[PDB]
C-alpha cells in the first residue's frame, strides 16, 4: 500500500525500479537511479536487502570455492612479516604459564589443520578462530610488547583481506 524508502502510495506516473531480492518497487529518484541508468544493471538490490546480503556472508555455508579462499587467506597470513608469533602453538618452554592463563589457545597451524579437514561450515567460525589468536595474544602480552603489536597489525591486515571474500 505504501512503497519505497519514502513510504508513499503507488503512483503510476513515476518510474519505479524493482528489487530482484524482495520484489518491492522503489522510486528511481529515491535510490539515485535514472531510467537510462537502470538499463545497465541486470539485478537491482535495494538498501535493506543489500545490507542483509552483506550481513549474511559470514553465516552462509562454505562452498568448495570458499575453501579455496580460506586456504589462500591462511597462506597470506602465514607469509606476513608480523605472523611469526602465530605460526605454531605456543611452546610451554618459552612461556611456562601460557597454558594456565590462556584457556582456548589457537594458532595458524591448528587453523590450517582445521581447513584441511573441512572443520569450518561458515565463515564466522574461521573468523572466530582467527580472532581467538589475536585476543589471546593481547590478553597474555603487555600492550607495549611487540607480540601485542604484532596481533594489532595482523588483525588489521586480516580484516582487510576478508573484504570481497564471498561471492
Amino acid at each position: 500500500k505504501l512503497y519505497c524508502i519514502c513510504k508513499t502510495p503507488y503512483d503510476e506516473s513515476k518510474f519505479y525500479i524493482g528489487c530482484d531480492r524482495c520484489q518491492n518497487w522503489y522510486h528511481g529518484r529515491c535510490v539515485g537511479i535514472l531510467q537510462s541508468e537502470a538499463e545497465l544493471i541486470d539485478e537491482y538490490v535495494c538498501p535493506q536487502c543489500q545490507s542483509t546480503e552483506d550481513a549474511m556472508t559470514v553465516l552462509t555455508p562454505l562452498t568448495e570455492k570458499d575453501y579455496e579462499g580460506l586456504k589462500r587467506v591462511l597462506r597470506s597470513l602465514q607469509a606476513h612479516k608480523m605472523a611469526w608469533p602465530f605460526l605454531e602453538p605456543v611452546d610451554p618452554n618459552d612461556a611456562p604459564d601460557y597454558y594456565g592463563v590462556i584457556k582456548e589457545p589457537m594458532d595458524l597451524a591448528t587453523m590450517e589443520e582445521r581447513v584441511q579437514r573441512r572443520y569450518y561450515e561458515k565463515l564466522t567460525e574461521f573468523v572466530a578462530d582467527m580472532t581467538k589468536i589475536f585476543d589471546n595474544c593481547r590478553y597474555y602480552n603487555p600492550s607495549d610488547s611487540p607480540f601485542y603489536q604484532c596481533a594489532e597489525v595482523l588483525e588489521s591486515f586480516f580484516v582487510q583481506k576478508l573484504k570481497g571474500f564471498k561471492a
Binding site: 605456543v90 612461556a95 601460557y98 602480552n141 607480540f147 601485542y148
Partner: peptide
Amino acid sequence: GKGLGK
C-alpha cells in the same frame, strides 16, 4: 599482559 612473559 596477564602472563609472566615470553
